[PDB]
Amino acid sequence: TKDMGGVIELKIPSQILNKAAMDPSSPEADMVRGLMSDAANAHSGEQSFFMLPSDTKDNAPQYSMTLKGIDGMGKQYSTAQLISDRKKSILDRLGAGFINVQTIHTQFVQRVN
Amino acid sequence: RMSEQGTFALAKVQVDSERMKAEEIRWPHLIGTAESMKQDATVATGLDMLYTFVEKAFKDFKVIPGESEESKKAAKFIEYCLKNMEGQTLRQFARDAATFN
Q1: Contact B94, B55 (CB under 8 A)
Q2: DSSP letter assigned to residue A5
Q3: Of all helices (H) and strands (E), which one includes residue A85?
Q4: Do B52 and A108 touch (CB under 8 A)?
Q5: Percent of chain B as helix, strand, coil, to the nearest 5
Q6: What CA–CA distance (Å, rounded) separates B91 from A87?
Q7: What is the chain A residue with the closest CA to B39?
Q8: Backbone dihedral region for residue A111 (phi beyond 0: left; psi -120 to 50: alpha; all else: beta)
Q9: Does A8 touch chain B (CB under 8 A)?
């Protein structure tokens, strides 16, 4: 559930964000409210695209849109095989470990009889 | 001649063997270390399968008599005694005896 790979991140100058918070009836407020709904609905389809201003103030740009990813290496322990070992560990005590694939199971039943 | 000239040295063979063991598996402790093992799901399973066939073997036991008429009468009495212990059966005895594993 928490593997947010490829999530959308948006960067906006704080002048617009701050103006909207203090002026609910200003043009900045309308555009901010539009972004909060448009970004939630941003799927992939027949008309998906992005258009951002290209202004620049420093070495970094004012507006940007990037898709995040894990900056490094992911998980290593492969929890899948951990569970399989423990399941065979449990069923072996009951003689029913063959489901993980005269027998052991038949001989085990004779003990109870 | 007809005279022993030595001893089995039971009292020495033990006392060397208790030193040459890690101290968690010497006599007065091994009783605890056995029951603190077993709760491993691979150790229990190995012992359980061993007892499964030991009980099976000593369930349908038989007494084999000799050739003379005296032996046949003795074999019948032996079978009666071994199958009429008050509150005990050979399967229970076999699964108690096999605890030396």
Answers
A1: yes
A2: T
A3: helix A79-92
A4: yes
A5: 65, 0, 35
A6: 32
A7: A93
A8: alpha
A9: no
